[PDB]
Amino acid sequence: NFIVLDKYIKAEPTGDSYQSESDLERELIQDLRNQGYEFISVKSQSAMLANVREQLQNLNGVVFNDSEWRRFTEQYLDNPSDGILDKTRKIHIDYICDFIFDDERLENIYLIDKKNLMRNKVQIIQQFENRYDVTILVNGLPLVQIELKKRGVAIREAFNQIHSENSLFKYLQLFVISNGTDTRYFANTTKRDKNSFDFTMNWAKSDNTLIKDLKDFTATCFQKHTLLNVLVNYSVFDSSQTLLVMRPYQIAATERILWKIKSSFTAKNWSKPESGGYIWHTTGSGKTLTSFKAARLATELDFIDKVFFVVDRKDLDYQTMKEYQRFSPDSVNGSENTAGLKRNLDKDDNKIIVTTIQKLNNLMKAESDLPVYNQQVVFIFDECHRSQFGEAQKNLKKKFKRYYQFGFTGTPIFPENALGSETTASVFGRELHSYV
Amino acid sequence: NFIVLDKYIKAEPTGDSYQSESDLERELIQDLRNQGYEFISVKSQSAMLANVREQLQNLNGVVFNDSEWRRFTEQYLDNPSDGILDKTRKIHIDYICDFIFDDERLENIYLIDKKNLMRNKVQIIQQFENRYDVTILVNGLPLVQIELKKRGVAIREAFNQIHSENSLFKYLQLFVISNGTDTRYFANTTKRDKNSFDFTMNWAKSDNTLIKDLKDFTATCFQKHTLLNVLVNYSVFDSSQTLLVMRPYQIAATERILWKIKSSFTAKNWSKPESGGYIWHTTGSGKTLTSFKAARLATELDFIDKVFFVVDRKDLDYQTMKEYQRFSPDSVNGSENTAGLKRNLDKDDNKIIVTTIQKLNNLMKAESDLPVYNQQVVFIFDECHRSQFGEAQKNLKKKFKRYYQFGFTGTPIFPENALGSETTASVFGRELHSYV
Numbered sequence: 001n002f003i004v005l006d007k008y009i010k011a012e013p014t015g016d017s018y019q020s021e022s023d024l025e026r027e028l029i030q031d032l033r034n035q036g037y038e039f040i041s042v043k044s045q046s047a048m049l050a051n052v053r054e055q056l057q058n059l060n061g062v063v064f065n066d067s068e069w070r071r072f073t074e075q076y077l078d079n080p081s082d083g084i085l086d087k088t089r090k091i092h093i094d095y096i097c098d099f100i101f102d103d104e105r106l107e108n109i110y111l112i113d114k115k116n117l118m119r120n121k122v123q124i125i126q127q128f129e130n131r132y133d134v135t136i137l138v139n140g141l142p143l144v145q146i147e148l149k150k151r152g153v154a155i156r157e158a159f160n161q162i163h164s165e166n167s168l169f170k171y172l173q174l175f176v177i178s179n180g181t182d183t184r185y186f187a188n189t190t191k192r193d194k195n196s197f198d199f200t201m202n203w204a205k206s207d208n209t210l211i212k213d214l215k216d217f218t219a220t221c222f223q224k225h226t227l228l229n230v231l232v233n234y235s236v237f238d239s240s241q242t243l244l245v246m247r248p249y250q251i252a253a254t255e256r257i258l259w260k261i262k263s264s265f266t267a268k269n270w271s272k273p274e275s276g277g278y279i280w281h282t283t284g285s286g287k288t289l290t291s292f293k294a295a296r297l298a299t300e301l302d303f304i305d306k307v308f309f310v311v312d313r314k315d316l317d318y319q320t321m322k323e324y325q326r327f328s329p330d331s332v333n334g335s336e337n338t339a340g341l342k343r344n345l346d347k348d349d350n351k352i353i354v355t356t357i358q359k360l361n362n363l364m365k366a367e368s369d370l371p372v373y374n375q376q377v378v379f380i381f382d383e384c385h386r387s388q389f390g391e392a393q394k395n396l397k398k399k400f401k402r403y404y405q406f407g408f409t410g411t412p413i414f415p416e417n418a419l420g421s422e423t424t425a426s427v428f429g430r431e432l433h434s435y436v
Numbered sequence: 437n438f439i440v441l442d443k444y445i446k447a448e449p450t451g452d453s454y455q456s457e458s459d460l461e462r463e464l465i466q467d468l469r470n471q472g473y474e475f476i477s478v479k480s481q482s483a484m485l486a487n488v489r490e491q492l493q494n495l496n497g498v499v500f501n502d503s504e505w506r507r508f509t510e511q512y513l514d515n516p517s518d519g520i521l522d523k524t525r526k527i528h529i530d531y532i533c534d535f536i537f538d539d540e541r542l543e544n545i546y547l548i549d550k551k552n553l554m555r556n557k558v559q560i561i562q563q564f565e566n567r568y569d570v571t572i573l574v575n576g577l578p579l580v581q582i583e584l585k586k587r588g589v590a591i592r593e594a595f596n597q598i599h600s601e602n603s604l605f606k607y608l609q610l611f612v613i614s615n616g617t618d619t620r621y622f623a624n625t626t627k628r629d630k631n632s633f634d635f636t637m638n639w640a641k642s643d644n645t646l647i648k649d650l651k652d653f654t655a656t657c658f659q660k661h662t663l664l665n666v667l668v669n670y671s672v673f674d675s676s677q678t679l680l681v682m683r684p685y686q687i688a689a690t691e692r693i694l695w696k697i698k699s700s701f702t703a704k705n706w707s708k709p710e711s712g713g714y715i716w717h718t719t720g721s722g723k724t725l726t727s728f729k730a731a732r733l734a735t736e737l738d739f740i741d742k743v744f745f746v747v748d749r750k751d752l753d754y755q756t757m758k759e760y761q762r763f764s765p766d767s768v769n770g771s772e773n774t775a776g777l778k779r780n781l782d783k784d785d786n787k788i789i790v791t792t793i794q795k796l797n798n799l800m801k802a803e804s805d806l807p808v809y810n811q812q813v814v815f816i817f818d819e820c821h822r823s824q825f826g827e828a829q830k831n832l833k834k835k836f837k838r839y840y841q842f843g844f845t846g847t848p849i850f851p852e853n854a855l856g857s858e859t860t861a862s863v864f865g866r867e868l869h870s871y872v
Contacts, residue, residue, distance in 0.1 A: 045502075046502050065601075066482050067516065070509065070510050071510070073506065074507070078506075080503065080507075080538075102516075165501075165503075
């Protein structure tokens with residue numbers, strides 16, 4: 001089911017005292033091969049590229065000769081004129097090459113299969129030819145680089161010590177830094193003070209249970225679906241350009257939201273006060289980012305037709321829209337009126353719509369039985385049922401039925417701070433995932 | 437010394453009855469390895485390209501990695517978008533790639549070393565994956581394709597029977613067709629009636645001794661310097677486009693001319709009536725082509741400074757010039773006057789000058805001790821000492837001294853036809869090479 005775990009797995013030390021740099025390598029290879037991986041031997045650079053033209057065969061089902069592989073190698077996969085940024089863009093944005101065969105038919109060669117990601121074959125290798133390196137290599141390309149240390153190299157100086165040929169090691173998205181007792185991970189940002197252990201991430205369980213050691217970290221995160229979802233569906237290549245990786249509580253809340261959608265659609269549920277739910281992530285979050293990944297994975301999920309991330313305007317429809325235009329390509333304005341918002345409800349393929357609740361009430365109190373009624377519609381609020389039970393919501397319970405009404409709160413109106421509005425007892429029902 | 441032989445070598449049958457297609461293959465491989473060749477085994481297509489990045493190393497003295505070899509393989513040597521014509525042009529015209537290293541220095545990668553051609557390493561391979569094929573493969577590239585037959589396949593139908601992958605076999609310049617008794621050779625022209633055995637060539641000795649069998653043909657022509665000179669210095673890629681290969685008597689006459697130059701320069705000879713010489717090739721020759729190769733190999737020979745291929749104009753300075761512009765790049769007009777011809781004697785790097793004898797007499801009877809006197813100058817006449825002993829020639833014996841005065845005749849004035857002028861007794865001295 002989920003990605004961020006709910007059950008605390010068994011974590012035991014298997015020493016192998018962690019003042020070494022090879023025993024934890026062997027233990028890590030043992031645990032990954034227990035998790036059904038494949039260890040091959042490439043003490044070279046070209047044979048690694050020979051692995052790609054065989055592992056990609058199973059993923060695409062078509063046969064290269066050597067002559068097509070010349071073109072595919074030098075024009076698309078292994079351009080010498082490219083660094084880390086465009087190659088990361090090739091990982092996350094342009095991951096398909098529209099390749100022309102010598103038989104002259106255009107076929108789409110993938111790199112990472114993103115729809116049905118079980119086909120994406122993983123392998124494990126280690127260092128060859130600096131320090132000691134283990135590499136989880138996905139579909140021929142090296143993606144995750146586990147870098148190991150000792151206790152004398154503390155976690156702050158672990159990053160601070162060290163930050164063609166080879167050019168193939170510019171596909172590395174992550175750098176899982178660990179020593180034997182603490183384990184942190186991050187993406188390609190290499191500053192000294194700011195990109196220290198504060199910007200890196202403690203992987204954790206659902207609520208607050210942080211993970212430090214290796215064996216528990218390997219048992220949790222390095223599953224196939226888990227680590228491939230962390231690589232693919234939960235990382236944003238911002239057009240700064242900067243790769244941004246979600247926090248684990250963000251991923252957990254997004255998974256609870258999307259599984260609530262998935263479990264509610266299969267049991268024909270809509271317009272129920274228990275069909276909703278709400279999240280409390282207060283601040284220091286990038287709630288823009290969590291809401292964006294929730295809405296973006298909702299849009300492709302094919303059960304629905306419209307997603308309304310909708311707030312109350314006090315310079316928010318200019319602000320958060322500017323956030324979602326930062327995550328460059330696509331989000332449709334609810335700007336500027338209730339004439340053209342209907343045009344946005346006519347349009348598709350860019351299904352995330354960011355409007356204000358006031359334009360929605362101006363649409364819903366009039367305009368005579370809109371034709372976007374029967375479609376499956378997901379609301380993502382801000383100032384949710386833990387902040388309001390507003391007149392717009394009872395207008396909504398009057399008009400709409402096939403809606404999944406979710407929301408976010410910054411400070412929830414609990415019974416402990418019930419001075420403003422009610423609690424959540426008949427609007428969103430249960431709380432889903434929180435952070436404090 | 438020479439290329440076309442003067443001594444009849446021993447030709448003996450070593451049967452191995454020639455109703456087979458494998459015994460003459462074995463005999464041919466035995467004879468070529470007796471002539472100091474190398475037989476490797478490539479039952480593939482890619483490993484043949486692996487031979488190139490090792491044999492070219494000795495020829496250029498520099499080291500590729502795999503990444504430079506990607507660029508050199510796909511951009512220059514093995515373009516998929518090229519056929520036979522541009523690849524033949526790469527053999528004979530653009531045989532150097534100005535390659536940029538990954539260390540960023542421009543160095544000139546050769547294909548065939550043309551100045552000191554002993555470095556050009558040859559190998560021999562046979563067929564793999566049609567009929568039976570033996571291939572002499574020069575410096576990694578396959579150049580000569582010996583194709584073998586039997587007696588039941590007659591020499592006329594031998595060509596007439598059969599006229600990516602592989603693309604490497606488009607470097608083939610020749611097709612030495614033989615059966616076991618007769619042996620013929622030609623270049624890339626594949627018509628039925630016209631490009632039959634008439635346009636192909638009987639290799640021969642100096643005067644008239646034709647060669648038919650294999651063992652004598654292998655003992656004569658498949659020497660390293662002999663076959664590499666036939667490939668390199670005695671083939672013209674005409675801008676028709678058509679590759680033209682010289683006749684053996686043409687090559688023999690050119691070699692006698694150039695060795696007479698080489699033996700006369702080393703013994704400080706000039707202005708002697710025995711320092712000259714003359715050729716009788718009557719017609720059906722392309723005397724334009726023989727004279728062009730004589731003058732062109734004279735110009736690069738570095739002993740001389742000026743070459744005057746000079747005739748008497750009856751629409752010849754427009755005709756033969758049009759022939760030498762057909763052999764596209766470079767030949768300087770003696771057109772149109774004795775004012776600008778002096779400009780042509782000032783200019784260099786295009787040392788072949790085609791003027792008329794009348795403009796020369798207009799230059800030599802006046803203009804007061806020209807400054808192009810002391811340079812080493814080779815005259816190539818037409819209507820030679822076997823056709824005239826003209827007043828221009830005694831003006832020349834008055835003025836010039838450092839000249840090598842050669843000439844051609846169509847019908848020689850022998851003593852047998854001495855009605856017109858004298859013989860050659862004090863002008864060019866000895867006859868050099870003839871054909872009838």
